[PDB]
Design a binder for this molecule. Structure first.
Ligand SMILES: CNC(=O)c1nc(-c2ccc(Cl)c(S(=O)(=O)Nc3cccc(F)c3F)c2)cnc1N
Length: 833
């Protein structure tokens, strides 16, 4: 430790937003043991990575180029437009043409160190991929637009340079509980419930005598459990809870990171229930020693299946993730564990049929996992892998075969799944996990991944006390290997975000909950932005939410505070790239008031749904806008260009306190389209994007939305906003949407029939991926909600995806829902005030 060493570590702390060397809220070694453990995987990935592919991070896919999109290539021909200083020049090109081939199919069209970069962006077309297999290229095809690439020097890889670095039964003594003040109620009773717990399966449970609820309550009882010390499984948690009814909980790992039984005296500060949630499982103690309840404790311690059994089995094995097993189901899985091993899809259920509190069963479990050829030969099924990483599996061997599968994800697919894999770190018993390290590896290997990993981790560190220490240790590890270049770049973004976040807080307080932005507010705002430009603010920052774009200077006069109780800022920037082919603006909405973690989670489910749709050649035209959560009820949102809310459209030549008429959306649509062509391209886009959002939202159960929360672009693209947030309609298909499709008001249309057609296609696309959608929704709820039912809330999607139907029963169902919305026209829209 020099200065040096510590100098650098001070930078890290501000990048993270947490001090990982602080050891004042720990009662053991684990965290520091993870900092040192993560050194090896990091270095291995630094040492092993390609310097120039790392510096240029092509964003590519191995996936087939969809039916739509080929249908946008005419004569096996793709036009690319190079640029050198003031010169341009197109180049006709073939789908399979590697960027190296294209570059010389240009030098022959009349040295080595020139790269095919994108205009506007830190985005290279490089490495050995058919151009059609770069994502920027596919963005340009889907979107009707031309590919523009500058010709310049390949970024110096030197900038990315990484810095030099017993058969006794188990018992617990419950000494007592202490809390500086209760005043919440007068009196009542309290007991401590101590649960021995594995994969949220309670192994044993004892409680204390009840006693009067006073500021200090002492017991001081040995609670003897039914289980032997030797049958405690690794990852087993002492769960300690205070009831009246549940008020407080905390957990202690019975077995530690060094495989030793937790021995000794503990005073543990607890988390308060504020009224099935990832938070409940944390091995972290509450850092607030002042206001917190504490508890103190001492630890002193080959055959042939009856054709119809086999079909019993296969029916169990073919049932959904949320289908409960019975004692019988479990005994059948376990008894026929080797038969079950032949089915990859049985793995979750088979592992839930294990008695984890028996050492000899656990051992037999390990013996069957040594026999892992069927699993290792199986194609990655992400949904099934995801299930083994959720709250029901606390065993490291089980969780580690799940991660093993994830190893073959391409980078493109990591990115689809990144937020939910970061969130899944919360179901890990230990800080250092095969999952922790896979995310670490994948981040260091790819800058795009590594950038989102930063903000994903940072979002949790800034607002999860339960989980911020774990996530900070993993973030530090990332940061000590991403390169001083990336480090430089994160520092800047944090700098800007902090600056811009003060301004949105300051400005909010100034405005009352009254629907008016006062002269002197927009005055106050314009002021700070100048008083900040113009100080203060970096010459240019990378847009988080979109790491290719770089923002430069604000456009003070386009900036404003938004017609919302939340008073978000609407900021606009000049794009610091001269080579950019527009002068369109980079818009970021900063907002305090909403939990944008919920938005993130939903938005990422929606990108996934679009990939599901792509595999079956459907484009439902979602606009899943960028949205980075930054701290407690605060963060950033992407401004969609030429977009207007659907409430604002209705409050037209009409006006305010009334009333909703069925055209207007159509007029606005023609009003906005320069040619009757463009109009029709818009009505088309509307039928698709409409369909996508009705399926998506019905499945996620977030369909009943008010139309100030539904937007549309000038080109017909519908999109829901503010997921926020939190008589029944299944989705928002109002008369004004129908008109545009062309069916006032109980008939059929060429375009309604199409809409109905597209919904049915896309719905059925999703149910093919039913098990994947269900695990995502279930983790979503556990790691990003208020409270959620370990039956009914999660089970919504089961019923939405119409599990255990044929394609017929389902098409019916969805067309039924389409109707409910038509039968109710404007009811629920009006029902708002
Ligand atoms: C009026 N809003 C817009 O024009 C707009 N809104 C968004 C947007 C997307 C998601 C969310 Cl969650 C939001 S917001 O609810 O936080 N901001 C907002 C502020 C004033 C009025 C609104 F209707 C808003 F949605 C806004 C994106 N691009 C846009 N062009």
């Amino acid at each position: 430790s020099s200065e040096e060493s510590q100098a650098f570590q001070r930078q890290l702390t501000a990048l993270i937003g947490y001090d990982v060397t602080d050891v004042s809220n720990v009662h053991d070694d684990e965290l520091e043991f993870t900092r040192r453990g993560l050194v090896t995987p990091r270095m291995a990935e630094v040492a092993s990575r390609d310097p120039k592919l790392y510096a240029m991070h092509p964003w590519v896919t191995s996936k087939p180029l969809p039916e739509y999109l080929w249908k946008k290539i005419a004569n096996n021909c793709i036009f690319i437009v190079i640029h050198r200083s003031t010169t341009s020049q197109t180049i006709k090109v073939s789908p399979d043409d590697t960027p190296g081939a294209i570059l010389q199919s240009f030098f022959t069209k009349m040295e080595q160190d020139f790269v095919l970069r994108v205009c506007g962006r830190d985005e290279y077309l490089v490495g050995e991929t058919p151009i059609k297999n770069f994502q920027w290229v596919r963005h340009c095809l889907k979107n009707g637009e031309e590919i523009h690439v500058v010709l310049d020097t390949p970024p110096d890889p030197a900038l990315d340079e990484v810095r030099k670095e017993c058969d006794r039964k188990f018992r617990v003594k419950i000494r007592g509980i202490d809390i500086p003040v209760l005043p919440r109620n007068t009196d009542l009773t309290v007991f401590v419930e101590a649960n021995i717990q594995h994969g949220q399966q309670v192994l044993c449970q004892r409680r204390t005598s009840p006693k009067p609820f006073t500021e200090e309550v002492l017991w001081n009882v040995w609670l003897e459990f039914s289980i032997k010390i030797k049958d405690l499984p690794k990852g087993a948690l002492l769960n300690l809870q205070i009831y009246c009814q549940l008020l407080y909980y905390v957990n202690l790992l019975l077995i530690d990171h060094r495989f030793l039984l937790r021995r000794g005296e503990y005073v543990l500060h607890m988390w308060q229930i504020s009224g099935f949630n990832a938070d409940k499982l944390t091995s972290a103690t509450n850092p607030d020693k002042e206001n917190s309840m504490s508890i103190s404790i001492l630890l002193d311690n080959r055959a042939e299946m009856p054709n119809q059994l086999r079909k019993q089995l296969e029916a169990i094995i073919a049932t959904d993730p949320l289908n409960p097993l019975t004692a019988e189901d479990k005994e059948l899985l376990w008894h026929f564990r080797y038969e079950s091993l032949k089915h990859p899809k049985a793995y979750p259920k088979l592992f839930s049929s294990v008695k984890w509190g028996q050492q000899e069963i656990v051992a037999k479990t390990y013996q069957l996992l040594a026999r892992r050829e069927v699993w290792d030969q199986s194609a990655l099924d992400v949904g099934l892998t995801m299930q083994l990483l959720d709250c029901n599996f606390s065993d490291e061997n089980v969780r580690a075969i799940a991660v093993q599968k994830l190893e073959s994800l391409e980078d493109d697919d990591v990115l689809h799944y990144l937020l939910q894999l970061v969130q899944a770190v919360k179901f890990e018993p230990y800080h250092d996990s095969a999952l922790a390290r896979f995310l670490l590896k994948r981040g260091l290997r790819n800058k795009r991944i590594g950038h989102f990993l930063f903000w994903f981790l940072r979002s949790e560190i800034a607002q999860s006390r339960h989980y911020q220490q774990r996530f900070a240790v993993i973030l530090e590890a990332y940061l000590r290997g991403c390169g001083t270049a990336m480090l430089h770049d994160f520092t800047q973004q944090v700098q800007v975000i902090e600056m811009l976040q003060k301004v949105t807080l300051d400005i909010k307080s100034l405005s009352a909950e009254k629907y008016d932005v006062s002269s002197q507010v927009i005055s106050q705002l314009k002021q700070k932005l100048e008083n900040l430009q113009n100080s203060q603010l970096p010459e240019s920052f990378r847009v988080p939410y979109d790491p290719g774009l770089k923002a430069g200077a604000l456009a003070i006069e386009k900036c404003k505070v938004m017609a919302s109780k939340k008073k978000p800022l609407w900021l606009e920037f000049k794009c610091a790239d001269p080579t950019a082919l527009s002068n369109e603006t980079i818009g970021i909405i900063f907002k305090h008031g909403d939990d944008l973690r919920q938005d993130m989670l939903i938005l990422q489910i929606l990108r996934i749904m679009e990939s599901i749709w792509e595999t079956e050649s459907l484009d439902l035209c979602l606009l899943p806008y960028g949205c980075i959560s930054t701290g407690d009820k605060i963060g950033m949102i992407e401004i969609v260009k030429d977009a207007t809310t659907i409430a604002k459209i209705q409050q037209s030549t009409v006006g305010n306190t009334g009333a909703f008429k069925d055209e207007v959306l159509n007029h606005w649509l023609k009003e906005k389209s320069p040619t009757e062509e463009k109009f029709q391209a818009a009505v088309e886009r509307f039928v698709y994007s409409c369909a996508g959002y009705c399926v998506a939202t019905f499945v996620l159960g977030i369909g009943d939305r008010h139309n100030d929360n539904i937007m549309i672009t000038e080109t017909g693209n519908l999109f829901h906003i503010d997921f926020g947030h939190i008589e029944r309609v299944p989705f928002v298909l109002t008369p004004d949407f129908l008109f545009v499709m062309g069916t006032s008001g109980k008939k059929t249309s060429p375009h309604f029939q199409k809409f109905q057609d597209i919904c049915v296609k896309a719905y059925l696309a999703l149910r093919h991926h039913t098990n994947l959608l269900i695990i995502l929704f279930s983790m979503m709820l556990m790691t990003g909600m208020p409270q959620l039912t370990s039956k009914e809330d999660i089970e919504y999607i089961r019923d939405a995806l119409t599990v255990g139907k044929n394609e017929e029963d389902a098409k019916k169902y969805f067309l039924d829902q389409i109707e409910v919305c038509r039968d109710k026209g404007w009811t629920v829209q009006f029902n708002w005030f």
